[PDB]
């Protein structure tokens, strides 16, 4: 494949985790490409393809958008950008075992996953008042959230390739942190 020089990185964060911003200045210091399912979709409606116009009438009626679709827009959008820069940072993603899998199967294994940490704690001192029915829904967003990616992040876990970042300090900590992690994976 001509994907045989990508390194691939994952990234994942919750609410409160800030994996935004860090994913905007990783960008702006290493020229990583930065591929979402959700700008890829959203390309995919404004190509005019059939498939994009059956996207677009799917995701009006509420309808999920299957893994491969998704799968398959990621792939081309790498086979189009891999000799620009070889790195690619994926956000928000994945999100379930059954996306990582398939990914490092269908595309190229990942080359590690950032993951972006915060506590209950942190995330409420953070978004919350110190609008209780508005605040309580981001609450049980983090947990949902938490709770849904713990087998993804246990499973990359077990091959050592987790980097996982206390994101509980300031942007600029965190950044600091991120690459210092980064480095061992052989990106500098």
Excluded: W
């Excluded at 994996?19 to 960008?27: A, R």
């Amino acid at each position: 494949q001509k994907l045989a020089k990508a390194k691939v990185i994952f990234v994942l964060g919750g609410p409160g985790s800030g994996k935004g911003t860090q994913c905007e200045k990783l960008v702006q210091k290493f020229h990583f490409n930065h591929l979402s399912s959700g700008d890829l979709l959203r390309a995919e409606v404004q190509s005019g393809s059939p498939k994009g116009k059956e996207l677009k009438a799917m995701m009006e009626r509420g309808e999920l958008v299957p893994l491969e679709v998704v799968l398959a827009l990621l792939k081309e959008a790498m086979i189009k950008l891999v000799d620009k820069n070889c790195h690619f940072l994926i956000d928000g993603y994945p999100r379930e075992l059954d996306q990582g899998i398939k990914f490092e199967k269908e595309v190229c294994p990942c080359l590690c996953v950032i993951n972006f940490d915060v506590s209950e704690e942190v995330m409420r001192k953070r978004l919350l008042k110190r609008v209780d029915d508005n605040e309580e829904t981001i609450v049980k967003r983090f947990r949902t959230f938490n709770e849904l990616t713990k087998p993804v992040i246990e499973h990359y876990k077990q091959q050592n390739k987790v980097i996982t970042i206390d994101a509980s300090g300031t942007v600029d900590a965190i950044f600091d942190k991120v690459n210092h992690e980064l480095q061992k994976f052989g990106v500098k």
